[PDB]
Amino acid sequence: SSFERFEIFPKESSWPNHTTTGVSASCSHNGESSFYKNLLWLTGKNGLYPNLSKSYANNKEKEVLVLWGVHHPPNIGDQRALYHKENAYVSVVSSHYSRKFTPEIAKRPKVRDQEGRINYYWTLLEPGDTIIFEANGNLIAPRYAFALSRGFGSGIINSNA
C-alpha cells in the first residue's frame, strides 16, 4: 500500500574501519565489475576486520523489510585473504528474530564464474522495534531498507503480455 526505499545504513558514515568497495565480476554493469545496490559487501580495511556492531530502531510507523547476506568463500584461502579469520559469525538479533550464521567453506560447482555462494536472508521489523547486526566476517550488510505497508494479499503473474 505504500513503499519507500530508504537508507538504513549510509555507506559514508556507518562503516569507518571497512573498505566497503568490494565488487563482483558476475554482477557486471557496462563491462565493469559491480555489486548489488541495496547491499554492500564488507571487507577488512588496513588488513583487519574489526568486530562489527550496528543497531537500527524502527520509527517509521510502518513495517521495515531488511535484507542482508552471508558470504561463504570457496576455499579457506579466500576467507583468509578477505576476512583474515578462519572462523567467523553473523548474529542478527531482533525482538522476534534471532539467528547466528557460520560460514561453510566448500568447493562448489561453478555458476556465473564463481566458486563460493552467498546466502540471502530477510526480516520484517515492527514499528518501535530494534534490529542488531553483529559480525566479524562474511557479512553482506544492508544499504537500503524498505518501509512498506502490506495491502490486499495478492500474488504474481508470469506472463509475456
Binding site: 490486499f152 494479499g153 495478492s154 500474488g155 504474481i156
Partner: protein
C-alpha cells in the same frame, strides 16, 4: 471477494502443495458439477415455462 488462487511452495513442502491442489481441485469439481446440473435443470424449467405460457 479479492483472491489470488496461486501459491508457491519449495521442494520440502509438498504436503502443503498437495493440500492446496486438493482444495483447488475440489472447488473446481464442485463448481463444475453444480454449474452443469444447474444449467440443465434451468433449461428444462425455462422450456416448461414457455410451454405453460402457451397453454395458458
Amino acid at each position: 471477494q479479492f483472491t489470488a488462487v496461486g501459491k508457491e511452495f519449495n521442494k520440502l513442502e509438498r504436503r502443503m502443495e498437495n493440500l492446496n491442489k486438493k482444495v483447488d481441485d475440489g472447488f473446481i469439481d464442485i463448481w463444475t458439477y453444480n454449474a452443469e446440473l444447474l444449467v440443465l435443470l434451468e433449461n428444462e424449467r425455462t422450456l416448461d415455462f414457455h410451454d405453460s405460457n402457451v397453454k395458458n
